[PDB]
């Protein structure tokens, strides 16, 4: 921060004395389920050496989590969001660059404990035989310990270039009925993967032994809503003061099968089966300060 | 946050030097026990490129917890709130579009602990009669835990549309008298569902034995209080400047019936048994900005 | 909040640019030992649709934990708080609505976490005689653990109406010397609801062995300042601009009483035994924006 | 803190009342992944002796954790980023000075418990047969524990001169799916290092047996994104009012192996086997207060 | 805080209304690797009985953890960082004074605990032959719990006076590898001090057992970098209105060495070996209100 | 606060619409080791009923922490300092009073926990002699916890009069090498009072034996620093407009020594042995709003 380096707060941003042009762009994709909005800012500080417009990717994307196949009544399929994805690309005859973006990448922490102990004890013991026995012990124990958080899905920064930026929001390991928890990957040699397993040896169809979408993380059924930030420069002397940018919302779904056994009830995961994606072309108009869609 | 990309805080935020026309619309609905209030500001900023109307759903949905049939002193049953909702939705033949809401959907975490551990010991030991004896042992443990929050009801932004949007509250799990907690599926094999059970085994009738509501979460029977926020957006060129907009107040009601088994007290409980909806239609006019009910 | 949506903070609050009409009204209940206070504000906002008044209800309801009976050594009673209320009302038949109350219910939550944990154990032993002996052993466990925080009353808002509001402040349980806690409906076999027993087999009179005030909630004797707020609105087109409002201050008593069994005191308590309730009228006048009270 | 001295906050702070020009210069190294930012701004505070430059370094250096060779299905490799960093450098024999920077290295910290216990206890057992026996017994121990944090990498300020600074971020240590954490140095007989290992004894492919990019930290894959600050201090009155600075970003990728054994797999871990280096030359004009790509 | 005596916040604060003067003074030390930096700022406040100068202290002092000496594989020397210092020193006979000075020491803290438990137990228990047996038991357990925290490095304001001030940033102690922590004075009778001990059995050669600098403290290698401030007041009515004044910038190693004997690596410290000295004169125009260099 | 009672933050405050004369006086005692520092600020605001001089007492008093006398290599002494004093003293027979102070004592606290706990278990038993056993137990066990911080000083406020204030912060205990705490009356009956023992067995010096200064609170050697305020006022119609008033600082120190007995070294400390005392007087002139030594 500024004030770290002797710099008074707020003297190195820009904006200062700067009208700004902002504006909403809605758009909803019914075959999809996803809810698109692009929040604008044009900035064009004269104190600043480029055009800058700050595009806020927002909106839900729907997370669909349901039963999509009824194969008699030992077998069923349950299709979940695996992954949420938001894209913005310049094409690459534009001058217009990608800049900035947040959030980031950040760097995970954990908590390490290590204990030493060391005892000493003694008894004497007696009976009615007028009998003494008598017991000198001694004991060491050296104990680890390893605690972190883990969230049900990761946010996360893709590789950036200068012409084309993204996120993803992962699914990464979820607790089922204070089991677990479980991830994509999780395998019981008896009953396979329990991501999304109601019960282990329930008497319904296999249709209605999926865990409640009420008791899972809200993100697979009702969905997430994204809230990322892309800035864009744009030199004041560039020849073509117009420019195209896509942007792309995308869903990733899983493939989890419950079949029964002899027995009891088995899950297996199939990773990334289906994928779902919306495109937009936006214009920027950096003369008039205005975006619009197509 | 514009700080984390170099800009001047606030300097992408709308709504600077303009007057906004703000109001409030009560209305309370007898029938449904529903205190409905609309809190609404009309954004006109001219360096904005849409006309923007928050709306802002209040007031409060009463909880109704009660205990309603007498079918013996043995069985009883009990109507209470198992989710509240709130929805508003725009004419789908029109322009104004659901451009934003508050709040969403977070994602969650829970802390997870590995721990390991080794010890060696070793004594000696001897009676009177000469005998002496020793022993040398060793150990190791592996320890797994999972810690995590729940509340008592869950908020959960549905999937919204740029026509549709909505909120649900639902009944996720609750402490009975420091055991449990208990959710809508608790099954124990001789007490049932154990939710709002006072006792196992007292001795008075069904209707005497249902948890007191002071001693339960207190949206089950006081209620719960909406604040949700919309963000409605309109093109200034629309030729139709005016627009409907419906706002739907829900409960949704289980029953939770106790019997008497000659041992001791069963309790079920009933999804989804009874709805309540209050509905509301208001006009919002556009240009002379401000919102009435009818 | 506004910045949660890309506005300005504060750019939909209502408030700026007008000149505020405040004020006190103080009356203290003797019979009931109330001490009331409304503070008001009137906000004629030109941008909002309608008159605002916010009427924050304070002062304070005391305790009045006490004995008031004590027939003989085996039994006295002890009257105390088990409820607080505040309760505001408007006539059915004006358009005056209540518009917006705080505080309101908020969810509560809890922790909880499972743990599972197996190990393995040997050992070897020896005699003097030459004897060699082992030991092979293994253990699993689970285990569940649940956390939650509790306070000593609980503040509640009752279902509110656009003419009715309230809030009970209600005894939830209390922690009784290290021990409990204890509640309403507390029971033990032997010793009966040990709420406020000051000691079980203590031998002294029984208005004595009651728990020392100083040592329970403070609530429980001293009182309880209610800090409520109310928002009434008022449409400018109304042609009867004058509005009377009821406030009711309300403690609700039980009735703690303990008698001695042959080896160790016993303790009961009965519920919502009294109720001491104090009321005012007002007169809101919308158009001099002032409150005043007995109109 | 100026408070700490009884000073108002922020008088001893430059720059107040004066005109800032900043600039970004953005670009991208398709070859090494690296997209870099530099930030910049001009502050010339007449009540400061010197002129100031203010840059930050920004973007983003793509991790790029991926195998890269297989020998068949019992052998393969995967490269992934140790380390991250960023320098700076100024002409030797030029007159502008590196003044400051941010962040810096900080001072770790870590808890220690120290527990003492003792005990006594005893029994009385006995048999139908009218025998009786006991046991009277004591114990005592001492426990140590050690806790503190680590980050899966740590930020450090390389030793900085007046022509010259940096970063770097590197690796420190990783849980891989519950266990460890492991680091580089990590070996156990049997498995080898096990840092990115899946499973142990998995029947699929080498190259099919690394930790998956998602299950461990997104700096490996995705990458990491600089946010360092850099102060240049420039005399008014030195003669040549242009400086050249140069810029490095630079991934120090280590070498991950995993070979079956013909029971189970093994990892070796080599470290710094590849460097990638980016660099890029700007003109810094004092006079103009503006900064230029000089490619 | 001034808001605790019921008087405006930073009403009594110097800086009000007054033009300040700063300045950055920049020079690196090749031979003692000493980045060293002066941020100063001149405080003229006409309602303030003296002229005041704020002297920021910052830049960095290089650690220098590296391995210097060998003697065969069996032995070998490392030079580490067990201080790092800087001192302020005024002519004993000038009028200017050293007012005060930030950060300065703060009172320490630690968390105890005491636990008291007692149990019963019981168990009834029977075989083949149809004996029955029992045991009544019963124990009391005490425990006591110290915690508290330990920074890798303390810093320290040295007793100032009012012509001369210091700090020293002083090695604590620090965790090797899960293990210690250690310090300076740590003592196995085996293995010695193991503060920088990599393996205590490993078959190396005695310079690659010591702990990689990654995996120590940032402070010991990449150095430290302070931010330490200092007032001096300046009577406006005295006769001579220039100060000189040096500024020291120091780094004391220590000397560790690890040993082979016949079995294992053995570890010793010798403390305050070596000491790296860097100063500086400036000049205070207390007149002009500038700092400068006298080379 | 002014919030809580529907007050404007900051309107009862006194300061606003003045000039506020300040001053620095500084001294140093170099026989007691002492920098001296006053801050003071003189507030006339003519809307409260009397002038107000603020008097922050600063500096550092060294802590000087040494050996100071050995007698043979088998009994050596150490100084160390128990306490450190700030006071300011008014004249009784003028009118300017003491009227505020800060810091002043806080409340302390503590945690406290009780548990419960009960459990049964049971097991059988056998051997190849085909002879078989059984088990039955059950326990249960109480505890309490007692857990609360302890500074290594205590800083207090002395009670004060209108004409006299001051503090002292006292040595309250200390950690010796992750052992103790100890303070001035730990009794050990083999090694006496351990506060400062660096070793109980050591065959150096009995000056070579006591706890380095770098690994105990830094304010036992270096020293402590005063930052206290005190608020004098004074009527505007008071005949005298100058008071002289006194400022004491004061360094206690403790005689912490070690000797060698037959077989390990023992400490012993003696309470308050020596007490530095340095003075200052200043003049308050209230007309001419300034202070100076005299």
């Known amino acids: 921060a500024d004030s770290d380096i002797n710099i008074k707060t707020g003297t190195t941003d820009i904006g200062s004395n700067t009208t700004v042009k902002t504006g909403d762009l809605v758009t909803y994709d019914k075959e999809n389920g996803m809810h ?18 700050v595009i806020r ?15 008699g009544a030992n077998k069923s399929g349950l299709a979940w969001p695996s992954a949420f994805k938001v894209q913005l690309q310049l094409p690459d005859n534009e001058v217009a660059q990608i800049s900035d973006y947040y959030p980031r990448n950040s760097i995970d922490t954990k908590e390490y404990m290590s204990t030493l102990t060391y005892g000493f004890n003694g008894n004497v013991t007696g009976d009615d035989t007028g009998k003494i ?4 012990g001694a004991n060491v124990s050296i104990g680890h310990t390893l605690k972190y958080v883990q969230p049900d899905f990761k946010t996360i920064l893709e590789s950036p270039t200068d012409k084309k930026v ?20 999780s395998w019981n040699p008896v009953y396979g993967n329990q991501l999304f397993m109601k019960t282990r040896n329930g008497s319904m169809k ?16 009702s969905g997430f809503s994204p809230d990322f930030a892309t800035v864009i420069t744009m030199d004041r002397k560039a020849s073509k003061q117009q420019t195209n940018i896509d942007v792309i919302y995308e869903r990733v779904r899983d493939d989890y099968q419950l079949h ?6 088995k899950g297996t995961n199939t990773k990334d089966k289906w994928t779902d994606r ?17």
Not at 37 to 52: A, E, G, P, Q, T
Not at 206 to 221: H, I, M, Q, V
């Open 133 to 136: 026995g008598g017991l000198i």
């Open 206 to 221: 296999a249709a209605e032994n999926f865990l409640d979408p009420n008791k899972a993380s809200s993100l697979l059924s």
């Open 36 to 53: 698109k909005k692009v929040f604008y800012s044009f900035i064009d500080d004269k104190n600043h050496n480029k055009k800058l417009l």
């Open 260 to 265: 029964w056994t002899s027995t009891n009830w």
């Open 166 to 185: 993204g996120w993803k929001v992962i699914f990464n390991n979820m607790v089922n009925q204070n089991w677990g928890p479980y991830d994509r990957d």
């Open 57 to 71: 990717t927002k909106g839900t994307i729907a997370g669909q989590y349901r039963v999509y196949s009824e194969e």
């Open 278 to 294: 919306s495109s937009e072309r936006y214009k920027i108009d950096w003369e008039k300060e205005e975006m619009t869609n197509l």
